[PDB]
Symmetry: D2
Subunit: 180 residues, 4 copies
């Protein structure tokens, strides 16, 4: 036994009490008093209960951004993993990894410089923490990525191997290996 310096410091949630507390509030009480998912987002990302106006905007941003079909990088990454027989959380994690400068992670930088731009601007105008901006697209698109994983599993989709005609093999001319 000895003195321990904490490894981490947390300010948003705790589970040592009767039930988990999100920015000091019990989820059962948040449910009982008519709060929603958008309110829990505000608590865990902003440490305060959103106003009615903010709640309604958060709800709409998430609904509008939930999915944009299977062709886009996040959804396609989740589909590729679903077809490779990967379990849901790990498959969605591969799709989530695609979120960044070119696909849906432009919201934080576009709010900095002024649907990544309307949302980015709106979130800056709501004075939400700068570090939180990408969260709206990450969370919203997780709804769609889970959906695509379920869809492929319902269909028992087989492994994807990209068709040869879809690849430009701009490879080196074949050479013999020289003696070492």
């Amino acid at each position: 036994s000895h003195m321990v310096e904490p490894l981490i410091r947390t300010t948003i949630s705790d589970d040592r009490g009767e039930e988990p507390r999100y920015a000091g509030y019990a989820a059962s009480e948040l449910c009982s008093k008519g709060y929603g998912i958008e309110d829990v987002i505000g608590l865990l990302w902003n440490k305060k209960l959103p106003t009615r106006e903010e709640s309604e905007i958060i709800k709409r941003i998430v609904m509008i951004s939930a999915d944009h079909g299977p062709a886009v990088s996040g959804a396609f990454g989740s589909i590729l993993a679903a077809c490779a027989g990967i379990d849901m959380p790990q498959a969605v994690s591969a799709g989530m990894t695609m979120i960044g400068p070119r696909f849906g992670g432009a919201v934080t930088n576009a709010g900095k410089y002024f649907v990544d731009g309307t949302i980015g601007c709106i979130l800056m105008d709501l004075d939400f923490p700068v570090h939180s901006l990408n969260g709206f697209f990450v969370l919203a698109r997780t709804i769609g990525m889970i959906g695509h994983w379920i869809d492929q599993n319902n269909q028992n989709s087989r492994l994807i191997r990209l068709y040869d005609y879809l690849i430009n093999y701009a490879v080196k001319p074949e050479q013999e290996v020289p003696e070492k």
Copy 2:
């Protein structure tokens, strides 16, 4: 000819269609995030009652503090300076049979119990003890008959008294709880058992059940990433005393 086949969403029009419905029209008519979840995972617009339950399941499942594998994985990546989506993806990778799996397994086994052991709770408990081990969704380290779980009491009371939904899995689990708690006080119906039963009773597709925990915990993981970044947290390196180095004896490398 096609590389993939999709059935849930169409982005070819002016805006995406989720199971045939336009996203802006869902917003305009007062629908919520829980409605979009039902559309993309079940291809059906939830009823008001189903929507209220989906809402509560997501809110209750959003986070469980920083110590658990999901949140902690996101914190470890946040402290390593990794960007939010990739950091949250590392936390999400922890979700599986040991972390989050109790929900899906409780739904699976309580559904099996209703179907195969409708008038035989002892037979169900014996089959589980032989084939699975502890019953998923039963038991808690601190919650008990003497120390009840407020989230379970709330969720059960809400679906029983504030909706007209039919819950055969949850009803069966509540009968199981009467039997298990008589043996040992800590063998209560836990939050994972309550949610797993409710999801089966909502008739969501079997492949969808893990989605509720994955999506809800993404709210908490994003929150932990933001929290670490707001604090300017530093890189984590486990202290030497937190490691039991049960290593091989030191040896000289022999000549080839």
Copy 3:
């Protein structure tokens, strides 16, 4: 003050000293004495310095499995993330997530089931195949999307030939899998002993830990996935959006949102 206990127990490496010790051996001393990457693999995954024969086999398994073009799930996943502008480690992690029962990660299970077959079905390949069909589903290590009897996998042919002609290794698992292949290919030409099955059997015959088997494919294919990420970045490849004609939109008829 608290009653502290270890959060983790480790047995493979010790970083406390001037440099890490891998299964008791100093990393720089392994370099100095002419050992290689394959020796470090043996130490960290098996806690034993490979013999020269084991070292030569490990080296070949990794070299032969390093890459198999951009069309396969792991390479394609790394390419998708590279084109999305994602940094190398995170992009390669998305490709690595694709390694599993259908692509590259059937090594562990192939080794497990062929070892079981040698023990429980030594002179009964049909019995083994029937048990697998009933209890597991497709046989891990059997089958390929492009390789077949007509289009053989020279990676498999090379590894088998190296083991058989250039080592004195006794290979009961590999021998049994080769007998299984004769039976499976007679039904369908694509039901060959694949790279995962070949590696899995060889590793079981080398008495490598059963938990280690998938490691060889995971590590080897990381070389290729990093290569694809570099390749796409050298080309300044743009974001990929799957062409509309490659998608069968079997979607619901469009509907108006009803009032609440």
Copy 4:
């Protein structure tokens, strides 16, 4: 119209061709893993010198114990019962600016320092303080002047005494280290700085630089996953005494 363009490998034949060379032919003629790395990342068969350096960088960097972010991430997933490739992918996600992935930036800034500040290390350090912040490739959590990193000492000695490599970046970084360590003992030239400088001095492709640590540390992360699985390690929950709960007081939810 192709979806992707590839230049490094061809799998269409009887076996793959890596930058035009057949895999089994590389095996047959006595080449190694380090030669396959050179082919797939540089599209050129390494010289004897390059091959020996690649081999050593990978061996030296393979593992650094369970306490570091990438190993700890793989262990957390192993303990959560996640399969090896997905668990190692969570550990690999930790590689970035603070852990293992400073190689590219260290190479970039030391190369620039050789051109812009050849006889002015204080000028370089002042520019970095103002424009970047901490110098990539400088500093370590445990290694210091009092606790040297023998991995760094060995690689530097090997390059200097056992190769023909002209090393302006490495030489410059070693001069920087003399200045930084005089201020604070922990501001050593770290493994990321050492590898980054060596790779720039070898004129390897700039996009390849982080590959060496990513690949090498995958050996260690796989090793940790196997180790935890051999031990049948249970799910990790970070001990409460390791967390500083600076959380809001428990409070009643206000009415809407």
